[PDB]
From a paper:
The I’m Not Dead Yet ([name]) protein in [name] is a homodimeric plasma membrane transporter composed of 590 amino acids, belonging to the family of divalent anion–sodium symporters (DASS). [name] recognizes intermediates from the tricarboxylic acid cycle as substrates, with a preference for the dicarboxylate form of citrate at pH 6, and the anion exchanger inhibitor, DIDS (4,4′-diisothiocyano-2,2′-disulfonic acid stilbene), strongly inhibits its transport activity. Therefore, our biochemical characterization confirmed that [name] is a DIDS-sensitive H+/citrate symporter that predominantly recognizes citrate in its divalent form. Each protomer was divided into two domains: a central scaffold domain (TM 1–4 and 8–10), which plays an indispensable role in stable dimerization of the transporter, and a peripheral transport domain (HP1, HP2, TM 5–7, and TM 11–13) responsible for citrate binding and transport.
Numbering used by the authors:
A (entry chain B): 32 to 200, 215 to 584
B (entry chain A): 32 to 200, 213 to 584
């Protein structure tokens, strides 16, 4: 009678108790830093527990800071909707423009055709396409985008009798082949998210927190440098994840395995069937001018990102040196040009052209605002802004001093083991809650800790920021896992066991690359830079 | 043939040509102010003609200001999503919380019980309530407050067969019917008009009162809370009554029995008794206010009170008590929004904790509102629209638009005092149609003060009419936040709103030009004369 009470109403218990239980933090101290600490604990517990929706929890600073002495109500609101957040929202809008006209389907099917259609070749192609797409699209959107293709080819194969999707007789148990495919798509989404600033919200969160805390940093996490740093590691552990998934499910390096015979009979007599369904499902027709325009706009946007401030030459944002331009001009420019440009050019038949029949009305633009209004996760505005505002309040109130001086006991550890334990803590934390919440909670703490110790702040922030996105064990860990578990009726035990591979691979790959090749990207990780010394002296 | 080309593809033609045709204003002048003037002209043309979606057009400043060198990109984005914008979005969310539970249905049924279920009487009652309420609260707050109530009233009238909410019909939202336009534009216009009643009615009044007081100390005439109300309320009542009459004439064909709109209203007038029996039956079959509705109503009342009791000028207000950091009205609004998620819907969970029987809740108890509902119903483009207004105002200040527009106003000194008053009112009305009211007040009020000092007339005689005129904007959704909120809630095309706003504009201009010269003399006897302190100020100048 009481157990099910805690089963059903534990979230309300957390909401009602946590502020009261954390009240002694304010009541037993004097400075505003302890009020900010009370707020930080309450918000962090709400984020990890998800007692309140993350978007709703993120609006707490707007109430708390003005009531306390932290900042005025105007500054707190302006902390929301920063420049980088506008860039991310515009990136989401452009990704929706790409999803409109089904450019993603065309690209995915074309690449799957280019790669072989053998079951292992199919799996490799699916992972590669999903990773490349998730580099520019939200992970959940990319997962729900790629799942239909593998689903359809699976019903085709099962109808042909080659293999069975679910075990013969609770929802049906998925077989190892379909588990491999779906888990591969989900893990590919998660891994490909880490390779770009706009790939996932977590990257933007920790990049923005680092840029806000350290404005004087010589090392900058702009779009091209971050992509340079992160792409090789992404490729390495994506390939290794694919290899592990093949070995665990499809019996790689096990010619005598039962699963190996499954793949073998899928190779003979099913390659033709699944190829045929690939071209049939590629009935999108010839490349329309609409898709071509969307592709050109997207490529132009990326090129503008790379040309903002290169060291090799000047480029824009240095020709226009009157003010800072900062990567929001290209994105919003592309978003607006999506609405300006038409999608037919059939109206040109009026001006001395034969063509065909004239249009009956106004030609549609590349995208409709109804589509944007209904497929943008607008709560990310509040979530990212709340992270930024909490970081700024922690800086201003005095949380930095308290936490840094409290956690100075880690100075005795060597840098390598400190990096290892930071990565392990980040992975363990993000295994149970949303990645953005974990980044918001830990990144300011890591910055202040690395200031207290004599450690370059990036050396701990960047590997941990990447590690916050490596969630593979539970459906609650990240939206793609929940989507896949819903699609394929994946039992939590199977996913938890299969996540051992990607977790270890990502941990080792990060721990090796951030020490070897991260030095190649930024040559100053090992030392303590001058600006870090100035910041430490100030705080 | 080629005529059909213009008929079908004129929007894209405007999009492609207007930047090119307006480029000369940039080219022939060598100033960042003229660059900003080009940007403003292009955005205004796109707004009036609706070549692009309004929300998309509001995105242009992010691209334009950094490129044009007016202001940095990080600053430009932060001018979006200001404190006031958070207040607006929170107000919309609280309105959605009211709409989630059928509280708006209850309010509409009670109001219809009170009034008598006649479209004219109901419209007049809602207009009066909105006016009196916006006398004390921010205009956008009252508009968002009243929108669900108006929706419920229209739904009830539709159910009784009195009218249709929307025209019968691919992606564009349904076109509102005449009566829907009448009611929604009515509450928007009523908010705008009632905001001019009191000092705390809207931020524009506080702004220009502060400007006058700071510029002119040692002044015999003051605009404190009682005197300003005594001066403004009669003229405001005249605005509201005449605007109501015009809205009735234009939409339901008042004084026009031949019009088809009159016939349907006359048909709806029939059978009032059976209508009221049906209405109070529909009120009765609704159960008593559930704890969901009671809690959301208590939260809404608390939010309204906190709005009113912050720096009212009559007494202390909680803002001055918590003066360590500047707290504004987004605090109570976001607090209410958060509490709408924290508080439960029912309380059966503790009911079975008391061993008082009853069915134990089988699952988590829902909160007062679900984020899925908010993500779907909030018009999120309002963020870009209202932020675009704010950022465009700030860019006008920084670039040099403010100084340039003021320099043009100096030339009006040659006109005679009555003609000068009319011209100033017209200029204020025209300017406020493209910018936030506070911005236009900041643009024109100091110039008016200096010009009045130079021409030796009482500064209030010009400041009050123009200070009030800065708030009457009824032609475009960008002109004032209430219009944008109404257009978002009920999809009102800019053509209909622009053609409907002719009435209120002319009405307000005429009644101001009359009531200043007549009634202000009753309020301020020294209004026509040039007081001694004004003489010493001019001598100092
Ligand atoms: C020097 C400065 C000092 C400053 C001090 C500030 C202190 C206050 C800080 C904020 C506190 C907020 C408290 C109000 C919100 C309480 C929410 C309780 C939710 C609730 O009833 O949950 C249920 C269990 O409740 C339970 O087991 C407990 C019973 C709860 C009964 C209602 C309690 C709240 C009454 C109103 C309080 C108003 C406070 C206003 C400030 C299960 O809910 P679920 O999990 O099924 O669903 C949850 C989603 N709906
Ligand atoms: C220091 C000084 C700096 C100065 C800077 C100045 C910048 C000026 C920029 C001007 C150009 C950008 C804005 C216009 C973009 C193109 C708009 C095309 C509109 C269009 O084609 O409309 C159709 C008719 O076009 C026509 O009849 C027009 C002729 C055909 C136009 C074709 C346009 C696409 C190809 C060229 C693109 C060039 C892009 C350059 C950035 C009818 O469309 P509809 O109304 O049926 O449907 C509309 C659905 N939205
Ligand atoms: C920024 O860092 C440089 C060295 O990297 C230092 O010379 C300069 O004083 C710093 N500026 C501030 C404002 O701390
Ligand atoms: C303003 O100050 C001057 C200074 O002598 C004084 O003569 C004048 O009477 C004052 N104005 C009023 C309205 O008292």
């Amino acid at each position: 009678k009481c157990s099910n009470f805690f089963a059903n109403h534990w979230k309300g218990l957390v909401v009602f108790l946590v502020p009261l239980l954390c009240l002694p933090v304010m009541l037993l101290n004097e400075g505003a830093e302890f009020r900010c600490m009370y707020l930080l604990l309450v918000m962090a517990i709400f984020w990890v527990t998800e007692a309140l929706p993350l978007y709703v929890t993120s609006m707490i600073p707007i109430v708390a800071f003005p009531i306390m002495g932290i900042m005025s109500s105007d500054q707190t609101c302006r902390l929301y909707f920063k420049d980088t957040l506008v860039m991310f929202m515009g990136g989401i809008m452009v990704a929706l423009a790409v999803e409109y006209c089904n450019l993603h389907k065309r690209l995915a099917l074309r690449v799957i055709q280019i790669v072989g259609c053998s079951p292992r070749r199919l799996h490799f192609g699916l992972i590669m396409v999903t990773m490349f797409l998730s580099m520019w699209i939200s992970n959940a959107a990319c997962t729900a985008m790629m799942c239909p293709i593998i689903q359809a080819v699976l019903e085709e194969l099962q109808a042909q009798g080659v293999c069975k999707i679910n075990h013969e007789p609770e929802p049906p148990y998925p077989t190892k082949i379909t588990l491999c495919y779906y888990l591969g798509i989900a893990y590919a989404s998660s891994l490909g998210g880490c390779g770009t600033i706009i790939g996932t919200a977590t990257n933007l969160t920790f990049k923005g927190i680092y840029e806000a805390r350290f404005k004087n940093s010589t090392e900058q996490m702009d779009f091209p440098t971050f992509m340079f740093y992160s792409v090789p590691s992404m490729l390495v552990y994506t390939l290794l994840t694919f290899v592990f998934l093949q070995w665990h499910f499809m019996g790689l390096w096990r010619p005598k395995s039962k699963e190996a015979q499954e793949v073998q009979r899928g190779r003979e007599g099913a390659d033709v069937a699944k190829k045929v369904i690939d071209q049939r499902y590629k009935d999108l027709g010839p490349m329309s001018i609409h898709e071509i325009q969307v592709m050109i706009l997207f490529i132009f946007m990326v090129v503008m990102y790379f040309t903002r401030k290169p060291g090799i030459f000047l480029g824009w944002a240095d020709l226009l040196n009157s003010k800072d331009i900062r990567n929001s001009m290209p994105t919003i420019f592309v978003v607006v040009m999506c609405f300006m440009l038409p999608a037919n050019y059939a109206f040109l038949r009026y001006c001395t052209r034969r063509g065909g029949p004239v249009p009956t009305g106004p030609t549609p633009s590349l995208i409709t605002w109804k589509f944007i209004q209904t497929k943008v996760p607008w709560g990310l505005v509040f979530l990212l802004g709340g992270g930024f505002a909490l970081a700024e309040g922690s800086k201003q109130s005095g949380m930095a001093k308290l936490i840094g001086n409290a956690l100075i006991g880690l100075k005795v550890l060597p840098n390598s083991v400190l990096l290892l334990v930071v990565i392990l803590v980040a992975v363990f934390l993000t295994a149970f809650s949303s990645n953005v919440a974990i980044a918001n909670i830990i990144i300011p703490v890591l910055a202040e800790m690395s200031l207290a110790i004599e450690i370059h702040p990036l050396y701990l922030i960047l590997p941990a920021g990447l590690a916050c996105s490596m969630a593979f064990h539970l459906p609650v860990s990240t939206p793609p896992n929940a989507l896949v578990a819903g699609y394929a009726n994946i039992r939590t035990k199977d996913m938890a066991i299969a996540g051992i591979g990607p977790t270890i691979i990502t941990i080792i790959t990060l721990f090796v690359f951030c020490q070897t090749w991260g030095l190649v990207v930024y040559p100053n990780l090992n030392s303590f830079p001058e600006w870090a010394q100035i910041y430490a002296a100030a705080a």
